Amino acid sequence: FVRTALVKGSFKTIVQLPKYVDLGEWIALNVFEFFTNLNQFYGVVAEYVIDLALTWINNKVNDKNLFPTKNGLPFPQQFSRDVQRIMVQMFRIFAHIYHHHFDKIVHLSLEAHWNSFFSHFISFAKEFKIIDRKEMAPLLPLIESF
Amino acid sequence: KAAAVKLKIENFYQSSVKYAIERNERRVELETELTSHNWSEERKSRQLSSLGKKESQFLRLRRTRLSLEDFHTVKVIGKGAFGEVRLVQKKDTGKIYAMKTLLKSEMYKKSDSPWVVSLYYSFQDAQYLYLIMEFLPGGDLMTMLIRWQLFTEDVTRFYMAECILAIETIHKLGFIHRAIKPDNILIDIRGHIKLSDFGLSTGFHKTHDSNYLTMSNRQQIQTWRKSRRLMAYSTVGTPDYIAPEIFLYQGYGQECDWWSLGAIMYECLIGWPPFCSETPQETYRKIMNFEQTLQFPDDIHISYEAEDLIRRLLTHADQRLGRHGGADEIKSHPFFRGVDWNTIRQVEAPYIPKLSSITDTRFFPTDELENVPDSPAMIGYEYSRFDY
Ligand SMILES: Nc1ncnc2c1ncn2[C@@H]1O[C@H](COP(=O)(O)OP(=O)(O)NP(=O)(O)O)[C@@H](O)[C@H]1O
């Protein structure tokens, strides 16, 4: 519909990959959080009315090969590919939730929390350019506030 | 009893504002982490040297993922009702490890120093907590005290002492143990002493157990006193030491630990704790008395000074007139010719354990017990810096 803009924090810094790290390990970390993040978010919204991909997300990250859980094992750099796909597993959830299911969410008036969280996911994406500006068609206008 | 209109809304799943208020932390935390990434620029500039490509590189680290079954179990080591400790190997790396399988519910009460057992991390399933420790190889003290009932002299002096210094350091670090009990004191590679910890394993003895021609046939005090080591434990925990400051009301403090010590010394000389009861509640009893009921047999051999210890060790936990005041003066007892109080840690140990290989459980009642009135029958990295 919908709504926006109350707030938490400033500004945008954290998402950049720190120095001398396998980006893959680094990638692999962050990607996993966002998963659990929405999980906990949907769980208020839960019922009142992806399992695969989150698990396909799960199963990606829980693939030892694509995912150097272990040590300073680097990542296949198709892991760098495994993830570029693995990320996009995620935006599906945000949008629809935000598109259709935000409705409920705002009633909660926890909105300033989901706002920063959704805003969050973005910053990593475009700094790391993990997505195309064309597939951005559904979410385009809101971003334009900045 | 009037009427009311909130109105609109209800609270349904309204408990997941947790999911709001909580991910605050997630951010608050997310903030201060990568500020710890500013630990760079250590830059000791006393160094005019290279250059020469890079002064570093990193992986850097990872929280990866985890669980049990990255663990291969070796032997049941020892037990409590909270659960079994165990010897185990890491499957993923592999190495020597103490696993104490402890209990999550139902359970109550809801570094840089050589002197104790060194834990590393905790991991758990639903049911058990798993404590993963340095595995102390010499056995507990108790299992030593059993194999031979120590003839001591310098030995109990030795096995003690480092007790104190450790306990000192503990106390000095602002902690009382209130468990000083032989199975809970630990002998290392060197046969030296690290004493571990309770975990915290709780539950405790109160309030009072009150029951209310002949024959005979005991035939010796010591004979009679053989009734110990009774079903391993398999209910427990007995009050070996249990300085009498605990019951009834609030109390204790370091005096309990030294009491516990002196009490421990008493056995290890006598081959039995001062208060040994033949029944769980026949202590308190004599323990509530001592004095007249602190009792040394007529098997004669003791020091005047050594006897003096345990008595003033088992004298009251009494404050006011006195000092105690211990851990030194406890260093200052006449029972001690030396030592340096220093060289102690490397000094030929009264037993240097002799083993065949790295896994040898020959120092434990590996045994089998397996009673855990719990099981039906049927992880994470949030830590900070690096090791090591
Ligand atoms: N860190 C450790 N390393 C090696 N052995 C240990 C360690 N901790 C305990 N033990 C031994 O294993 C037995 C049980 O573990 P322990 O901590 O002592 O039991 P618990 O559930 O804490 N309470 P308790 O068994 O009565 O002491 C002991 O009697 C010791 O033999």
Numbering used by the authors:
A (entry chain B): 100 to 148, 182 to 278
B (entry chain A): 282 to 391, 407 to 508, 549 to 714, 740 to 749
What did the original publication write about this model?
In the RAM network, the hippo-like kinase Kic1 activates the NDR-related kinase Cbk1, which forms a complex with the coactivator protein Mob2. Here we describe the crystal structure of the yeast Cbk1–Mob2 complex, providing what is to our knowledge the first structural template for an NDR/LATS kinase–Mob coactivator complex. In each structure, Mob2 binds to the conserved N-terminal extension of the Cbk1 AGC kinase domain, a region previously identified as the site by which NDR kinases bind Mob proteins. In all three structures, the Cbk1 HM peptide is wedged into a binding slot in the deep cleft formed by the kinase’s αMob helix, N-linker region, and N-terminal catalytic domain lobe.
In addition to Cbk1 intact in its HM region, we used a variant in which threonine 743 was replaced by glutamic acid, an activating substitution that is at least partially phosphomimetic. We also solved the structure of Cbk1(HM-E)–Mob2 in a crystal form that diffracted to 3.6 Å, containing two Cbk1(HM-E)–Mob2 complexes in the asymmetric unit related by noncrystallographic symmetry (NCS). Cbk1’s activation loop forms multiple different structures: the higher resolution Cbk1(HM-E)–Mob2 crystallographic model captures two of these conformations displayed by the two NCS-related models. In one form, structured parts of the activation loop occupy the substrate-binding pocket and thus occlude access to the catalytic site, similar to the structure of PKA complexed with an alpha helical peptide inhibitor. In the other complex, the activation loop is not present in the substrate-binding region. We suggest that this is an auto-inhibited form of the kinase, while the other state seen in one of the two complexes present in Cbk1(HM-E) crystals may be competent to bind substrates containing basic amino acids (right). Although crystal packing interactions around the kinase activation loop are clearly different for the two complexes of the Cbk1(HM-E)–Mob2 model, it is likely that the extended activation loop of NDR/LATS kinases switches them between an inhibited and open state, with phosphorylation of the conserved autoregulatory site S570 (near AMPPNP in Fig 2C, left) alleviating the pseudo-substrate-based inhibition exerted by the inhibitory helix (αINH). In our crystal structures, unphosphorylated wild-type (WT) HM region (HM-T) and HM region with glutamic acid substitution (HM-E) associate with the Mob2-supported binding site in a similar manner. Similar MD analysis of the Cbk1(HM-E)–Mob2 structure indicates that HM-E also has more restrained movement of the HM region within the binding slot than HM-T, but slot compression was significantly less pronounced compared to HM-P. This suggests that HM-E is only a partial substitute for HM-P.
